[PDB]
Amino acid sequence: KQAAQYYDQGLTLIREAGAYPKNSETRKRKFFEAEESFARGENILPNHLKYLNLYGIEYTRVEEYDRAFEKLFGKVSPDFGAGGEEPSSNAWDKREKVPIITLAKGQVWDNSKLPIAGKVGSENRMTLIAQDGIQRKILKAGAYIVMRLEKQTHDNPTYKNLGRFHSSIMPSFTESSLGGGKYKNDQLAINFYKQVYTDGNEPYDEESTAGIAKIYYNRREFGKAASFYNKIVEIDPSSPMGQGGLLSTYIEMWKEDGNPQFVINHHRQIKNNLEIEKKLSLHVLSKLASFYTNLNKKELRIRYNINPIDQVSGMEVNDNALEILDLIYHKTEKDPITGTEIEGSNYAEGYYQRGRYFASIKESIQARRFFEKAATLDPAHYLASMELGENAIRLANFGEADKLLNESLKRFENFKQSYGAREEDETLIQGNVGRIYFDKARIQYLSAAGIHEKDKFPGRKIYPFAKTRSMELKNSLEGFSKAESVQTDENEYTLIRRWRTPLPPEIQRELRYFKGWVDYMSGDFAASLNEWSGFEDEEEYNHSTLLMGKANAFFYTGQYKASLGNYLKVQDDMEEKLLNMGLPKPDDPYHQEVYQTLVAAYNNIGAVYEKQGNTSEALKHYWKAIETARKINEVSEIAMSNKDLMFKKEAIGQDPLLEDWLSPTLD
């Protein structure tokens, strides 16, 4: 249609305006042009339900909720709950029931009674009355008004779009601090979806059931959300909306309890017996890729009694992620709401999930390429920018990493108010911005520990100091504090606060080690022991850097017996590793780690023996440290001094020297 051409032009102008900040000259200009195009299309085909609905959704997606409501519903004076001395229960944010509207007694529909600029209609226009008995003048004929009073019909896409509108989760839509809260009403949203089943004569409309389910999903009531998705599949099991909704819900429960039985077993049922894996949405498919990348695969058989390899598909759980990510790239998807299609080759979240998979399997060049693509396709994808910053940290490009991490911060602050307008926003909502603070503080920490862009051993052989090096470490602790302060920050938007996933164990472990290392290098050995004592059961008596740092601090606090235990354990581990390796190679960095640690443990074992009065085993162990060092073309000046000074001590209680260097990282 010619009207449809003007209507389409206005939808494009609304999408175009979305790339401009609110209150900007271009944003206002593009909306004015969109409404002029709408008026051209209205002068040809007025009261167009499809176009009234499309304008309402595009406006909603660009956070123009007043504009959206005048399109999806209309404008009445006085509006619901807005009239003088009119109860607040009638308002859009308080009412439960959908307004059952009829025109005034003895009144018929006339297009000339709509105050349009070109209409110039009479002073007597139209009046609608809802179950409240209040007479309201119709200023704008939106979709809901057009369907009930002009067409005298019940349009289900209209009811469903109203259900999606009133149930939106965007912070600008809900937070009163942003001007929102006016149209937020989940009870009223459920009641617009329920109108399809009865007045809309469609009792098993899956879009209405999935709409109600998504409302409970967003309230984190995954149990109720599961019932409604299961109600869709009780009727039609091949439904990608029902099965997809179930898979999405099981993934959220899995994040909460660590149990993958339901996600894995349901995905296999969906793939091998239903054959609807390809039919699942780009968003559901991306969540499943994320699941497979994050899953503990080595636990499955013993801990959860799940076969790590499929029976019908014959595929290990590490192959599932790539297959799913590949499916995303070649998939094309029509938007169920607007009808506009998305090519998987332009889907940013899919690329981000792909970069995460390649990062998980140590393909960092490949991972960098996909994170760069995600960040470009979506200027709001702050997690792709954070992962790019983390990749630059690994490569020792701290100046580039800082710049990327500041982009990550600006991306979060610039778009968070719209979180929830797209399904892809769940990734952004569920991310922790405290991780960006941890990464920034991890750069400030390495810079204080002498690690720079040229240190990409002996860079990790850092000795406890002397004056300025203890200063720049203690300042980096404030950055590690902001990182922890974010998860507990009650200042953030309700949506981000209730969905913000806490800092992962691997970062928490690094955080404890980093804090303890600053105490250790500053001479606060007791504080480092109190910090490192919290370390997990399996990692306490396992990591050699931790065992060494703890033993050094034990010696410095008089706990000679406790230190001996850790050094002896490290000695056994380093002598064990020595059987796997052959000839000592100084150029090789792994030989440098093993031999250098073994030198420290030998001398330190000798130091403990000296303190206990075992001159023989003290001298033997200093000699062991001296000879071990010579094997990698090195000298332990500390062990040479302990050996030469054994009976040449010049003060009472003069302790032997420790080879007390310590790696700034637990790698």
TrEMBL record:
**Keywords noted in UniProt:** Membrane, Repeat, TPR repeat, Transmembrane, Transmembrane helix
The record's TPR repeats, renumbered to this chain, cover 206-239, 348-381, 599-632
Q: What is this protein called?
A: Cytoplasmic membrane protein
The answer to whether the entry has keyword Mitochondrion is: no
User: Can you name the source organism?
Assistant: Leptospira interrogans serogroup Icterohaemorrhagiae serovar copenhageni (strain Fiocruz L1-130)
Tell me the domain of life: Bacteria
The answer on whether this UniProt entry bears the keyword Translocase reads no
